[model samples]
Target: KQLRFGLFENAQTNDSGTATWRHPDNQRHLFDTLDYWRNIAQICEDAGLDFVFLADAWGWADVNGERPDICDVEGLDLPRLDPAIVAAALIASTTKLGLVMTGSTLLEQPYSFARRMASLDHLSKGRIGWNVVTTGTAETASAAFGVPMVAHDDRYDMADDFMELVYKLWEGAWEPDALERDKQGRYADPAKVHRIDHEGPYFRSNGYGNTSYSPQGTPVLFQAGSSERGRQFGGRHGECIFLGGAPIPKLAEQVRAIRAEAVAEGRAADSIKLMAAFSCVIAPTHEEAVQKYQEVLDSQTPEVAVASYAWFTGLDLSSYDPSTPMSELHTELSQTQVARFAGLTVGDVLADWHAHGVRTKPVVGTPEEVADAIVELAEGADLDGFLLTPVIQPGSTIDFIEHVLPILRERGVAASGYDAPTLRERLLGTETPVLREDHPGAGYRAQSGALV
Candidate 1:
């Protein structure tokens, strides 16, 4: 099978982790403009990239120790635009590219979240995916909605219930032929529709969903939960699991563990796809590419980058000295982040973080050089593909499309064109575009009588 690809979407010119929040060519940090995102969506559609996954930051990152001023002035992790809104605009902008937005399980009511996604799937012609996140930031608690953040694994317990509730609403609420559109008869068969009588420790819903279903039945589920508890949750729910920056061996190890977890969850080993986050700053020549990346480094400082990551993983390293060994530390949040640094020092973390935060190694080279890196990593990791981060908005994207993709195509790594209709078909390499029989959501299908 040909390798798949997805672009990582962030509001700022550079990702929140970088100090290049305000780049010279692009002062367009203002996400209020649909025009900018529309351009990006069109670019991905034209490039034959698989999908675009939009991320969210409900709160600011104060380096795990400092005041809000650190994030505010540094332009690190702060609040973000409603990515679902951006997804709608992107859907209207692109014809074939998939649109995904991170939706928080902790903050949202499953009933409305399910319906909203179903509506988007309808609007996008089954091109919607939801990245399920159990948010735990304190700012999200008091700032966005006046509620406290749940403790670590309890969030996943709540997520399990959240998924159960949403599954009922999305799958059990309607039969395949629920729409009884007969010329002389009713619009829908009430008997065909179901009432999702769901009640759990975290969520509750009593009525049938208004939107019967979309083309794919439900939006494809994506998750980035990589903690031990998180992996189990992802194995059970996610069709695709987004992983952090790592090498082939590391990603392969993670891939095996996640697949093993899926098997334990009573699903096929390959039911979930794992994608290492990849990033590059490349151009016509290796030197030019290096220079460009160097400029980016100069723009984004080490401490700023360190703080951004400290907040991103919720593993605060800001208080530690550069010489401190990461193995000494432990985190209730994203233990995987700290685990990677077990043998390395805090300085090592900074250097590695500068290289590429949790996703994959950085690449700064010509098209040929970058393609070589891509092929080597893909083959070495035995990876599904990547979620490429944008450095300079769509400029970096267009560069990859124009310069790097042709070589990858020659190597049979990147497809020349899309053959599948829905994002699920494209990503999963299957014609059947819905949850699998073994998946937790599929059990909720009305025919299965799971919710009943």
Candidate 2:
């Protein structure tokens, strides 16, 4: 399997160890701040990184009672650009880099989502991918679309229908040769395109895709759900799976389960790529790396960490005492994010080293040490790659690309240069961007007999 590396494109700052939201220019940072991300993209491209994955949420990051009015984090109350637009800019600036953005199926209509991704795939020339998310936060539920949040498993059920709708739009609504622009004829071949008259339990639509079929047919599918229902959903639909956890053994078990589920779903056992979240703090020596790690830890505020967790899990942790044990606090609320933090007790989940505001385990050491650890983690967990979250925005990412990536390349663990043109090609070892034959999307292709 090819190793893929990406950064969550939030350029964070740190002063005295705590996260600083504003830049030196005193501007409220926005994800569309082209200058900020352009530099990061150039660095990743130079390092031969596969893609730059942007993490997003519809609602404000207000949790643990730290509202936008109070918190100074870069992510809170800031204007974020649409990931598709940002991806376009990055693609324009660099060559041979994959661009991906998160879009929630629960909030947007499948037709709109599918068409937008198709447009992006065209703009990037098949270098685009979509991170499918079933919006889990109540804030996002109330704000983004005004829809009530459904139960966790039911959300997955909705996602199943949502993916079905999009697959139809992306792969079935038009044939590969659907658009024949004949100027003399004054029209294209209407017979080649078909309407998707889909009426599911959650959505209803009757129309053909407005855009022509993309070269890749469909954007790469990326899903990050670790719940049982989430995992099952990913096994059947996702090409790349993002996971978060601390312990190696437990993550390995989860990987095995996902692959088993994929095989049972009649997909290839290796069809799903498992990726874990990690943080790298590299230096010339282990001792220097340890010092930097300590600096980051000391700068992290427990309250800030708790707030982020609450926002993600949709739980109000402010009501509980800081000393409260997590096991005693295990409610149906926020179970997905909470349960994945490893360790049995909620207290451990909240206060343990893994529970530290940093969602990823720190890989702090020399370049060689970091590379060895990455290989070990991938081998032990049976993972294909990693989704790295930097402790401080561009700095952490810059350091990894500058210091550690070379070592990884030398060791044959990381790619020395772009091997494929598109993101899917680089990660999946394919020259094309079409979904795998076993993928659920393949069932929606126009050539598929069942679709006819």
Candidate 3:
């Protein structure tokens, strides 16, 4: 099978942890414009990418009870548009390209969240997916909503509750034949509609879902949690699991563990599609690519980058001694972030953090060489694809689409065109658009008497 591809994006100037706004080629000035995103969507669709993944958040990095000044000045994660709305807007611009937007279970009510997703699926002809995140930086994000943050494990528990209700609404409330639209007689078949009475520890709903079934019963589920509890959560609910990038061996190990989680949850080994985060600097030749990457590296502002990291991980690295090993430190915030630095000293963490800038090292080379890197890593790690991070806005994306994709397509690593209608179908290479028979959400179908 041909490898899938998606762009790692935020509705902001700097994306994928780089201070790319500092790059001369980056179009930071037009981030707030719809025209910019439309151009990007068109480019991705033309290149036959599987989807455009938008990362989002409710709050910025708040460090030690004070907002970090550098985040605003550097344009890290502070300024971003609502990704769902952006996704909706992009639908009018293109067809066949899936739109995956981040939606936080911790922040949104299940009913409202489910309704929006179903609406988008309809609007986009089922090319929609949801990246389920249980807000790791709860201290800052929760405070924005005037509530205290729940503990780490407890947050996942609540997210489980959240998913239960959304699944009920999306899967059980409307049957395939519910929408008759019979103008001569009944508008909809009453027998096919259902009222879901769901009561969970953290959420309760007793009503029929307002919207009818869209192309996909539920939007494709994407999750990016790597902690012990997170693996189980994703195993039960996620169709696509986005992972942090690492060496080929390390990524392979992660792939095995993640697939095992799916098997443990009684799902097929291939149920979960795994993708690693990746960034690249490419040029016409290897020497030019290497030299260009040096310029990209020079564009990084360490203090600004680390401050953004502090916001995400909730650990103020400057507070601890520089020589302390990461294994000795504990976190109730982002365990995976800390685990990423295992066996490394705080000083080493700083150096690595400064150098990598919160993402994997860029694959620097010519078009053929970049394709080689992509093929080798995907094959070695058993990964479905890579969430390509752009170090410079549309410039980096344009370079990859123009140069690397041709080589990848020639090698049968990338497709020349999209083959499926729904985002889930495209990503999972399935014939159906809805949740698979073995998926946990499929059990909630009204035919199965899952709704009370």
Clashes of 2: 5
Give the C-alpha miss distance for residue 132 in model 2, angstroms.
0.6
Off by over 4 Å in 3: 309-348
In candidate 2, position 236 carries an lDDT of 88
Candidate order by decreasing lDDT = 3, 1, 2
Model 2 misses residue 101 by how many Å?
A: 0.8
Residues 1-452 of candidate 3 have per-residue lDDT tens digits of 57889998888776544575776877855878999999999989999889999988787667667776787788776677899889999999988999999999898989989999999999999999999999556676777899877877688999999998998888899986688887898899888899899878989999889888889989999999888888889988999999887889999999999999899888999878999888899998899999998887777776765576666555777767778877766544367656677678878876666666667788999988888999999999999988988877788898999999998889888888977877888899989898988898899888766755
Candidate 3 structure, TM-score to reference: 0.92
In candidate 2, the residue pairs with backbone N, CA or C atoms under 3 Å apart (3 or more residues apart, or in different chains) clash, namely: 12-393, 17-299, 326-346, 326-347, 327-346
TM-scores for the candidates = 0.90, 0.86, 0.92
Candidate number of the best lDDT: 3
lDDT of 1 by residue, 179-198 (tens): 98888999988788887798
Task: Summing lDDT over every window of 10 consecutive residues in candidate 3, give the lowest-scoring window.
Answer: 329-338
